[PDB]
Design a protein around this ligand. Structure first.
Ligand code: MYR
Ligand code: CA
Ligand code: CA
Ligand code: CA
Length: 184
């Protein structure tokens, strides 16, 4: 919103408590609607594209899809966005991709979330979201059943530097802001 890359880096390393204390003090209801989310993070009056991205990001973190990001979804979201353990983030990204929570990531689920968080904008060269998705399965869906187990995910993404970056760093705070002020 209103800060440079160096500022975003410092925030990325800012303690959870600082983020939580500010949220709970400003949102006593323990919830944020999308509008309040924009106000809180200084994300309003963005271009149509950036605004759209902000909306889908909000929806992505709105785990129970009730239209609000509550105190639990807030810290879970920050656990992925802020600096943390790559080892721990692998499982949390998997859970995010597993839309229906059946313990497996199917082609459709991966495609939807990948588009939502614009992960392919991180790539480098021509790569459609549908193309990148089919590539992921072609490369890490070992038994070719159309589903990614946690095992296949962790194993495959850790053996491919490209998959690791695009699939588990798309929500880094610095990458999000860099993505925002770049759509308008
Ligand atoms: C512009 O520079 C805004 C700086 C603050 C970035 C806010 C982006 C927050 C998105 C991830 C956090 C989600 C917490 C539920
Ligand atoms: Ca919610
Ligand atoms: Ca699933
Ligand atoms: Ca499989």
């Amino acid at each position: 919103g209103n800060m440079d890359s160096k500022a975003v880096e410092e925030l990325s390393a800012t303690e959870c408590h600082q983020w939580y204390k500010k949220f709970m003090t400003e949102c006593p209801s323990g919830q944020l609607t999308l509008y309040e989310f924009k106000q809180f993070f200084g994300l309003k009056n963005l271009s149509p594209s950036a605004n759209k991205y902000v909306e889908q990001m909000f929806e992505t973190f709105d785990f129970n899809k009730d239209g609000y990001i509550d105190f639990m979804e807030y810290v879970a979201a920050l656990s992925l966005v802020l600096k943390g353990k790559v080892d721990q983030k692998l499982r949390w990204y998997f859970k995010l991709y597993d839309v229906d929570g059946n313990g497996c990531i199917d082609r459709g689920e991966l495609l939807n979330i990948i588009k939502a968080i614009r992960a392919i904008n991180r790539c480098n060269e021509a790569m459609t979201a549908e193309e990148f998705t089919n590539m992921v399965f072609d490369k890490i869906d070992i038994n070719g059943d159309g589903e990614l187990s946690l095992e296949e995910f962790m194993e495959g993404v850790q053996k491919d530097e490209v998959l690791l970056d695009i699939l588990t760093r798309s929500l880094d705070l610095t990458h999000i802001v860099k993505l925002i002020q770049n759509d308008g």
